Design a protein around this ligand. Structure first.
Ligand SMILES: NC(=O)c1ccc[n+]([C@@H]2O[C@H](COP(=O)([O-])OP(=O)(O)OC[C@H]3O[C@@H](n4cnc5c(N)ncnc54)[C@H](O)[C@@H]3O)[C@@H](O)[C@H]2O)c1
Ligand SMILES: Nc1nc2c(ncn2[C@@H]2O[C@H](COP(=O)(O)OP(=O)(O)O)[C@@H](O)[C@H]2O)c(=O)[nH]1
Ligand SMILES: [Mg+2]
Lengths: 299, 161
């Protein structure tokens, strides 16, 4: 076998070791949710009876809605060149920028990354501090070790799940959600408070339901998910997805996102774009005929 | 390019087979909560292998990829005699999918280094491969630790392309 094996360049080994670290982060959060599965369900049923019948049936309906929701990554087509982004054949987080240092600290405290210090892939998921240029000191720190952020658009927003970052958005395939951790608030906000117990996986949406917001003004997440489970149609609040703390369910994709392999649709905004109508229609028709899918959707 | 869905019972050796082909190493046991995906270049062919942790509870989420699923690698623990029939039932459910009727099936009789492991013939008899019709299949005795049989199965997939 060893005779036939070609080998791997260090930059490729570095990416794989990072992805293996990220899968351990997800497995760490999933084990946390399996440990607290009873108290989470009891807390979720407590909230359902507090609002509203067989709470077990209503909870299952809300879990099936959140699981069958679409995963969106919003962007501003007028401020970034989506053409340069699509040609990269891969989506990358911010580690590939003085905010990264704080983002590393948030990710280290939110995902309990210090609990993986004894892992054989820890040297590839630890920045080892940041240099003067806000770059990691560790020469082995891999971009793939940190998640790609998205939003769980369970209401099918007109401009995606987090329109605060642009009117355009990628829609990822549903299987990508199985590699995601979920939070009721953006993990970089004060309402999240670096609370690891607020993180759930794709198989423990009951934690997301018991921890989501029930604000008395503005967009209400709990009441929206409850009414959608009761087969009531309604227009989502005008601030759905706008606002980092509590106005969207933050998702963390632990794994790489390739274009267009992990992409179901790309909704390019016509009114917010650096390209003209004729140019955007050409890009859509060109990419669609090349993939034999309806990936690029202008709107 | 060839798209491969690597499925099978847990603890069979799916993740180990994937990253032994990718890294040449034996990765530590990482419970596959979601799924792993790696591209392996072999004989000028780019195998994109999706290591699905357990689609037993998420069948509709992966039917998007079934239409472009060119190969199915089913890994079975050749030492787990108490669960070999369980693997057969899961294999039958994977073969009864209409969107996978044109895909090839490669069975990996994994963990052959263990003393009580069944050979490829005994696994072929317990899974019922000889009773299959209109399915281009093949079974290979493999050991993800040492790496034996891994490239033999990849050679078979390359020929079916
Ligand atoms: N954007 C969303 O949809 C979304 C969803 C939920 C939460 N959030 C939160 O918002 C924060 C900031 O979001 P944001 O979108 O303003 O910044 P970001 O964190 O997405 O910044 C990354 C930047 O790199 C660009 N990029 C991606 N792949 C690239 C590649 N291959 N080559 C070059 N550039 C590439 C992205 O388009 C973006 O401009 C996130 O860190 C997250 O905490 C965002
Ligand atoms: N002896 C032996 N052990 C193996 C082999 N392949 C996997 N294992 C063991 O099986 C355990 C878990 O296997 P895993 O890759 O997680 O299987 P999966 O869950 O189906 O992906 C690991 O601890 C390995 O040591 C093999 O070919 N031989
Ligand atoms: Mg597994």
């Amino acid at each position: 076998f060893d005779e036939v094996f070609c080998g791997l360049s260090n930059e490729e080994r570095k990416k794989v070791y990072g992805r293996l670290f990220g899968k351990q982060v997800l497995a760490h959060i999933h084990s946390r949710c399996q440990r607290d599965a009873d108290i989470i369900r009891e807390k979720a049923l407590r909230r359902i009876s507090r609002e509203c019948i067989d709470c077990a049936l209503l909870l299952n309906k809300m879990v099936d809605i959140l699981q069958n929701a679409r995963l969106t990554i919003n962007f501003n087509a007028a401020k970034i060149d989506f053409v340069s982004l699509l040609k990269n054949k891969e989506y990358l987080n911010s580690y590939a920028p003085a905010y990264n240092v704080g983002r590393d600290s948030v990710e280290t405290k939110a995902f309990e990354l210090e609990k993986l210090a004894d892992s054989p892939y820890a040297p590839y998921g630890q920045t080892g501090g940041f240099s003067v240029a806000y770059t990691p000191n560790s020469r082995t720190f891999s971009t793939t070790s940190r998640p790609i952020y998205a939003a769980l658009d369970f209401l099918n927003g007109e401009n995606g799940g987090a329109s605060a970052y642009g009117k355009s958005f990628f829609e990822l395939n549903d299987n990508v959600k199985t590699n995601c951790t979920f939070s009721p608030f953006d993990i970089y906000g004060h309402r999240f408070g670096l609370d690891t117990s607020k993180l759930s996986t794709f198989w423990h949406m009951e934690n997301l339901i018991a921890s989501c917001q029930n604000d008395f003004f503005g967009y209400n997440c709990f009441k929206s998910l409850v009414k959608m489970a009761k087969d009531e149609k309604f227009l989502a609040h005008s601030n759905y997805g706008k606002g980092y703390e509590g106005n969207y369910i933050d998702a963390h994709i632990h794994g790489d996102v390739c274009l267009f392999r992990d992409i179901k649709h790309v909704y390019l905004s016509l009114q917010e774009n650096s390209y003209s109508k004729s140019q955007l229609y050409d890009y859509a028709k060109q990419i669609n005929q090349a993939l034999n899918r309806d990936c690029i959707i202008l709107y | 390019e060839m798209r491969i869905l690597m499925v099978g019972l847990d603890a069979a050796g799916k993740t180990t087979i994937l990253y032994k082909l990718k890294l040449g190493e034996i990765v530590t046991t990482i419970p596959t909560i979601g799924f792993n995906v790696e591209t392996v270049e072999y004989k000028n062919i780019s195998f994109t292998v999706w290591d699905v942790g357990g689609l037993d509870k998420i069948r509709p989420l992966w039917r998007h990829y079934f239409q472009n699923t060119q190969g199915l690698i089913f890994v079975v623990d050749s030492n787990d005699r108490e669960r070999v029939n369980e693997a057969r039932e899961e294999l039958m459910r994977m073969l009864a999918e209409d969107e996978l009727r044109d895909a090839v099936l490669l069975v990996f009789a994994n963990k052959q280094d263990l003393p009580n492991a069944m050979n490829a013939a005994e696994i072929t008899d317990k899974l019922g491969l000889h009773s299959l019709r209109h399915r281009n299949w093949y079974i290979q005795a493999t050991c993800a630790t040492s790496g034996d049989g891994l490239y033999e199965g990849l050679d078979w997939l390359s020929n079916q392309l």
